[PDB]
Amino acid sequence: LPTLKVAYIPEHFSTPLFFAQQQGYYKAHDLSIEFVKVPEGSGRLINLLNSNEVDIAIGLTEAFIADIAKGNENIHVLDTYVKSPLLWAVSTGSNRDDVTDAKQLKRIGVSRIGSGSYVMSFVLAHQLGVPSFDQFQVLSNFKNLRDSVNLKDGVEGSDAFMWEYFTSKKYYDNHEIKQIDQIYTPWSSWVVATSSDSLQAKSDVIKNFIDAVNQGIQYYNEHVDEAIEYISSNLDYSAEDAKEWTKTVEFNSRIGKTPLDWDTIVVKTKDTLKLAGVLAESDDVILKRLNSNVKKTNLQLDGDLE
Ligand SMILES: [Ca+2]
Ligand SMILES: [Cl-]
C-alpha cells in the first residue's frame, strides 16, 4: 500500500491516533504512515492537502466544510473523527468589571475574519436572541486576544472573544481572563479529510487507515486512564484538565463502518457559515459542492473480478 502522510494536530484529540501507533494497528493494516505535526491549525491542514504535501488531514469540521463550499473541489470529507461538539468559551478581561455577561457586547475580538472565533460569534448572538455582531477586532493570535480584553498596551481594546474552553481554562485558573459564557458548536468537532489526488491514487490505503483509527479509538475508550496519563505527560495539559476533558469527548467509534451524519456535519455547518457571511454563493451551488465532496458512504475495496 502507498505511503500515507497524515497531517494531524498535536492536541488531546489526537490521542487515539497515538495509541493506534503504540499498539501497531497501522503496521497491522500494512500501512506506512508518516505523521506530520501541524500546530498551526486546520487552516494549514487544508493548505498541505492542496499542495499535495500530505495525503490525509484531521482538523475542525467547519474548516473543511467552508473551504469546500467556497469552491475548493480538491478537498474531500471522508468521515467524522469526533462525534461530540467543540466547546467554545466566551472570555473577557479578568478585571473587566464593566463586562459581567455576554449581554450588551460591542467589540468582539477574533484571531482572523472567517476563523472559528469569528464564525462562533454569530452562533452566540443567535442563541442570545440578538442581532449579529458587526464590530470585530482582528488580534491575529490567542495571546493578543487576552491582552485585548484586558485592555493592555500594544493592542486595541475589545469587550470579549471566543476560544476553545480547555485552551482558555489555563488562563481562567491563573486569573488572567474570566468566563462570561459558553457555546457548543452545532456540528461535530473533528473530521477526516483528504485530497482528490490522494483519494484517487491511494483509496485502499486510506480505508485501512480509517479502520486503524477505529481500533485506536476503541483502545482509547478502553484505556481512559492510560489516555489521561499520556495527555498530561506529552501534551500541554494538566492531569486534572485531561481528566475532565475525557468526560466531554466522544470519538466516532463507528468511523469507517457507518456513513457520517449529513445533518450534523454538512447541514448545520452550512447554515452557520452562511449566517456568518462566509458563504456568498447560492444555496444550490453550495449544496452541490458539498454533495460531491462530502462522503455519504464508507470507503470500499474494488471487487476481485474488477
Ligand atoms: Ca476589582
Ligand atoms: Cl471550483
From TrEMBL:
Residues 88-183 form the Ca3427-like PBP domain. GO terms for cellular component: fungal biofilm matrix; periplasmic space. It is found in: Periplasm. Pfam families: PBP2_Ca3427_like. InterPro entries: Ca3427-like_PBP2 (IPR054364). Its main location: periplasm. The keyword Signal applies. Gene3D superfamilies: Periplasmic binding protein-like II (3.40.190.10). Keywords: Signal. GO terms for biological process: cellular response to sulfate starvation. Belongs to the bacterial solute-binding protein SsuA/TauA family. This is Ca3427-like PBP 2 domain-containing protein. It comes from Candida albicans (strain SC5314 / ATCC MYA-2876).
